[PDB]
Symmetry: D2
Subunit: 495 residues, 4 copies
């Protein structure tokens, strides 16, 4: 008999695993335990802090929630109104000196007139083709052109997605975008050209990763195992037993694995699965943070992401992270020396001066098809912020952050579903629910609300026979209000 024995074992305490844990803890039926190699729960949804006191999310923030169950877990973890800030859900595209509001096509009235013509002409061609279309598009690129036409495709969605995915649009599938038919709204785009013409909540303290620390605090501490004591090293699927760094063995009846599915295959010493997982493609992500002295720029004022399709900066999206919360960066009274100016030069005084401060966060993608010079990427990003007029050449940088995440994005390549329906059934037959951004490799359910629910539904499947709707039918869950599953169900009321 092994060291510890449980019914369902949860590996990993990012959002997926915490979902699995929260539902196991709600049901309070089968015994369970959650393990993670990091002392701090939250996975890639965590928040780092520089030596100078600037916070940086690793893996974005939730701008829309699809599940009342997700909301119920957040409300429990952070229950006071002074725990959250409310911001308008907006975003902009940086295109030819302009900040073009989202969605890009409804705002091309900001571009030069001659360029509007090329855009509308392309969309007319798409609209007429769409009138006689009788096939689904097969590649992401096909989807883009059928939706936007060539003009708008080339200005934003084509170059932007190469910077994001680090593979061409011609090599990616498009089922992941949803079942909305790939046609343009010519009347809307043209009308806005002719005329010349909804919130989210963010944690007040802790950054996004503070949510998951708070959520994890609701679990019984004795049923958790975080840090070096809980790193998994071997998974023996045949004896349903897991071995840890310190040699502790955990036997299970059913297993929810949240770790990257290729790492699971390596830890299983299963060469069939290793061969399969190596067919999956992914990009790595450089997260770069820049802390600046001063008040923020006038023209980049609200709490959003910014998209950069153009060649004059390495990053694909940036956010003025200091707008999300005053607690993401130091008080103005804190004294910090200027490390450098934005143009690259050393400062006048190395004296520690007061604030106030603001903060920019960037993302650069890397893959085998788009390599990245690691030694210059931070400087190249800072130059890009000067090129996009987000920093003046004279701005004082007081903090820099740069971390590289090997598994950044799971790529929706053409080959992905073919590979994945060989992997997930094979692990299913061994009683392993591999779920998550990299547990099941589907980006379109890979943000925080979807990932959290992948783990809830996986447990709901193990105990209560529920359908894994998020795992298998994203457009279904994304197209409805999921109000049925709640943190207090009938099952708990009736006891």
């Amino acid at each position: 008999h092994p060291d510890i024995s449980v019914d369902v074992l949860v590996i990993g305490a990012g959002p997926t695993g915490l979902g699995a844990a929260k539902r196991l803890n709600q049901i309070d039926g089968p015994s369970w335990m959650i393990v993670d190699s990091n002392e701090t729960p939250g996975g890639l949804a965590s928040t780092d802090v520089t030596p100078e006191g600037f916070l940086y999310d690793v893996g974005g923030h939730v701008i829309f929630s699809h599940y009342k169950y997700f909301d119920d877990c957040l409300d429990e973890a952070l229950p006071k109104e002074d725990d959250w800030y409310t911001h308008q859900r907006i975003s902009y595209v940086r295109c030819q000196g302009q900040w073009v509001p989202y969605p890009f096509q409804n705002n091309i009235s900001m571009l030069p007139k001659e360029e509007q013509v090329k855009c509308i002409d392309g969309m007319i061609d798409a609209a007429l083709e769409a009138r006689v279309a009788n096939t689904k598009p097969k590649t992401f690129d096909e989807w883009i052109v059928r939706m936007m036409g060539t003009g708008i495709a080339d200005l934003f969605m084509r170059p932007y997605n190469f910077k994001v995915w680090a593979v061409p649009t011609t090599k990616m599938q498009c089922a992941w975008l949803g079942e909305r038919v790939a046609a343009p709204n010519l009347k809307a785009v043209t009308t806005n050209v002719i005329l010349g013409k909804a919130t989210f909540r963010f944690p007040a303290r802790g950054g996004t990763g503070g949510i998951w620390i708070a959520v994890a605090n609701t679990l019984p501490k004795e049923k958790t195992r975080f840090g070096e004591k809980g790193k998994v090293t071997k998974v023996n699927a045949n004896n349903k037993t897991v071995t840890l760094q310190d040699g502790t063995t955990i036997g299970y009846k059913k297993l929810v694995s949240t770790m990257a599915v290729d790492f699971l295959a390596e830890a299983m010493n299963d060469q069939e699965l290793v061969g399969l997982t190596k067919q999956l493609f992914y990009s790595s992500t450089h997260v770069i943070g820049v802390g600046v002295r001063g008040s923020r720029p006038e023209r980049i004022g609200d709490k959003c992401w910014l998209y950069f399709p153009e060649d004059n900066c390495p990053f694909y999206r940036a956010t003025i992270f200091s707008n999300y919360s005053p607690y993401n960066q130091p008080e103005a009274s804190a004294a910090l020396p200027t490390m450098q100016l934005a143009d690259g030069s050393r400062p006048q005084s190395t004296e520690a001066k007061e604030g106030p401060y603001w903060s920019i966060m960037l993302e650069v993608s890397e893959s085998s098809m788009k390599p990245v010079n690691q030694e210059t990427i931070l400087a190249d990003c800072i130059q890009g912020l000067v090129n996009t007029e987000m920093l003046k050449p004279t701005d004082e940088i007081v903090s820099t952050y740069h971390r590289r995440f090997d598994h950044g994005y799971p790529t929706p390549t053409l080959e992905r579903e073919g590979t994945l329906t060989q992997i997930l059934p094979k692990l299913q037959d061994k009683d392993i629910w591999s779920r998550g951004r990299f547990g099941s490799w589907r980006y379109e359910v890979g943000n925080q609300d979807h990932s959290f629910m992948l783990g809830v539904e996986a447990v709901d499947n193990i105990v209560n026979g529920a359908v894994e709707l998020t795992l298998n039918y994203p457009d279904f869950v994304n197209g409805r209000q999921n109000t049925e599953r709640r943190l207090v169900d009938g099952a708990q009321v009736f006891a």
Copy 2:
């Protein structure tokens, strides 16, 4: 304080309520009791038997492994079921046209084949440039079949079924399959002279060996704890007080609940709630009544009848819309050959030679005739008019000897998918939901397309699963989703019951 109090109360023990019961009993969490005014479980899915021993139902295909687990529990021996191919035909112009109708029009006159194919070319070319969804049932038919084939079968037949025109019915209930024709399939079978039907060795169904269909539900209900049931006059509901969450029975016993699953017809529920708003709305729903007529025949089954199973009648020469050779489904649906029965009449109406009781063997026909305000039915002659229709459709020779007759009329037969149905229904169910009432079933939730036995059984399962485990009511709200997949996740033994040992 009331007489009995439970967490979830199920009204009605037809397939829907038994689903609710099977799942409440599986979970074994909150207390419950199921009531029905009928001493015999099964509701309108039960089986009658004539004084002469002929059984008559009021046919399955299973979309859920949960349904399979419960049937396999109720009737577990291989000798409890018979397996048959899904054989069906359309009676059209002297021919038995195999289903699907459009793939077999090679049996009609050549000049008529030309009109059919011409209609379908027009449909195929329109479908190539279509950019709207069909809005009425009639629209859907013509886009699928073209004018010719629509007029021969699906237009007239559905009027006999539903007793309303195809132009006054919606079509979301048929699915999201785009309304286009397979011109090549239709055209190829015409060219080849081929006659192939939509059945085969794996296109089968199972039927209960004994008891008829209603024997399934007797068996299913037998697995429940008897003390948690209340069937018969002792279980008729008369008042449902939604505001104090208590229902009153025939004998005056009061049952108080925390959640209510109502399998009774929603117009009757509204009446029993003394709620004039809800009653007003339910009276806006449309429905037709159904006459079931059974005929027992002396002889071995005719070669003309064959292995046939259901038959469709779009034409004017008989009152019924569907017929079944019920005697092919099971040898136990009619008496042994050694049983002696007198001939009651011949199919042409004349008296037999002797009133003597002669032996069999026997065979059995079941018919269905619909009645509504726009299509009335003479209660006093429909049986005779049905038997004449059997002679006209060449199912009986004038000389066949009839040894048993059956006729029952069911007030609530089909809930009609009218254009107005969803408009009304989305006012009723939210109102009943706010009073903590899950009205589910063929008439509990009034949606025909999830109204056969497997869907309704699961309507009650999912309603219980929603009440307890926050599951989505997928069958109730997304019929095309459940119908397009194999529903393997919910099983009669889930993890929750395994992990309790």
Copy 3:
């Protein structure tokens, strides 16, 4: 035997009849004579002059090098003609919108631009899956422009022209060009805010005499003795069975083949044929009021170098206006001519009845009349002058020195849905009796009813009588209009091979 006998007899010396005559005179084979009830050749293509010296026609574009040859012969010096760019506008919502209308809707309010483009997007998407031809003129319009652009111009305007709704007219007469929109063209000028018209693209106009001066010159090339114009040449009876026509003075002309240029309904009456009279009475037509206005001053800049103007709106009775004074300085008196002001544009009396000098300019208007849209003969002149003020062509203070008003009973032969059904009963019957009934009202087909087409109807009718040539213009308008017709010339091989 009758009084005169010829091989081909041409009745009427409008452009159609003069065509037949020019060709009969060229071939110089069969004998012929041309007759007309008007002492002045040119028919409804003539030019009137007011007592005060302002000329008024009732604009050419030539599809035939033969047409050019006859004009170039009649008026051969360069100073017999003036050259102008093809400049026309639509008066719409206070703006002069350059033609073609749809390429210039950028002058309309933005909210209205949206309705137009949205209507044209619908039109383009329908056109992408169209598999039928339009059946009515209205159908043709909407398929070309969409609802929005159709309602602003081509629908209301064509009603003012034809005095029948566009749904009751056919559209084969517009040609075989597919009825689809150039959405990219329209949408691009809206985005850029551009305006441009379809004018290096010129037309020529006679320097003196107006348009009817062309036809005077052309008629002068004929042998005088082969004509009979005036009261002496009015035809009163046409006896189709004895192939003889009798004149006002009782003179009988015998013919072997007859080219009748007069209105075919009058032809049926003069043939005393009750079957044909019934058939011709089935044809529909509209009457035309021509109104001329002479104004004092140098021409205003608001008018500019404009030429014809189209008026789809309800605020003036006329459908088209012409700045006749821009075509030629000799269409109105010199500045040194002295004339009294008759009235101001607002209706009031002038200060003095003294005759002041010029310069002058000249406006010409057209108003249509039919049983479906009547016209008050007693007020139309005043209603027109008010229309000029409402459309900002005249300021209320502009001084009018000449007014002109003539009404033409047979103005436009209407391309109704029923026209060809009727016409394919009338023309074969008159053909079997050896009568080539050709022309704007001789054959009643508007789309070949302007001057170059009509002149050639007469030429081709003769070429058919003598040389078995195909009557291409009469029967295949889109064919002749879609090509350059360089083969027939005023000097053919037959004439070179005889000198």
Copy 4:
């Protein structure tokens, strides 16, 4: 001044040139003369006779006349009722042992049921594509498949046209087929599957008897046929042509009916020689077989052969057209060979009756033809296609090869042609005809006859050359205006 001087000079007395001659002679205005290197008028529409008494047309027969003017000229040449035989217009395709009536697609009910399915399946695909098409077809092959679908294209029109033209269908244009939109009549094809107008021919002389008769109506002295009238030099700049014998004929306008590449050579005009050499054309082998017996148990038509089992693309039972196309039954002839290739037993001259088959095989730079074996290969082909029994007795054979047979409607043809003909137009040369202007679609006899008439009508009377420039226009109407007796002649 040269030896002869006339206003219009016509080179060649095929149907085109005789058209030009008939109209010049009717107008009777400008002086004119017509020359031909052949003593016998009719060009490639003439009729040969074997030493054994069997007639064979060189260049087919007219099955429909588009112009009342053509009819008037025929009616003059042969005015008696018993000068003509009247037969039904019809043709068949030999496909998988069946004689499939024309048009092929409306009669596929004769093919096996399984082959009908692929035909109809292919045509449904074509019908659905046509419903959303917005481009015209660009190649002949595009036209075929859009009209017939793949199945029916592969059984007949694709393989048949490769045997006719000796180029792939993908390398030919399709404007020459007309303005009829490239869509299928699916309902018609399907309805006939579900359910399951004459021409006249000369009684004597074969087709070439028409042109001898039409030519007989001309004034003899204005003609010059034979070695005396072969043209050897064309000096377009001094408007003079030189003959075989050194005679010079000077002209004011020239109607050239000879093949335009030969005209370019006689002009010693290297610009034109280079341009004409870009035109593609195929040669034709005409093969006749005279057989002993009565005809096999049909009627007077052409037969089309898309399949691999015979070299020829079309065959006709020429003997059905007229009894005078072959000897009387009382005529004695020895059997030359059997259809199987063997020589007969006796050199005995036996009686008839007789019948006659005429074949056509094409040859081009992409499709060579063994001149020494093609006759035997054709006779075998007649046995393979069940037109001859292996034992039928052949009493006469005919084989002549025509270098300029068909002018090929290649994709490049119009691009090349709009450089040649306008250049010759400026030199006052009307190069018209089957090879004078190289357009197959107006290369049959009525169109060619009218090419010459209209060319004269343009030179004299300024008429539009409608047939040369608008074949679909003339083909879609009845051309009744130009007649052999016009007003111009009545008024004199």
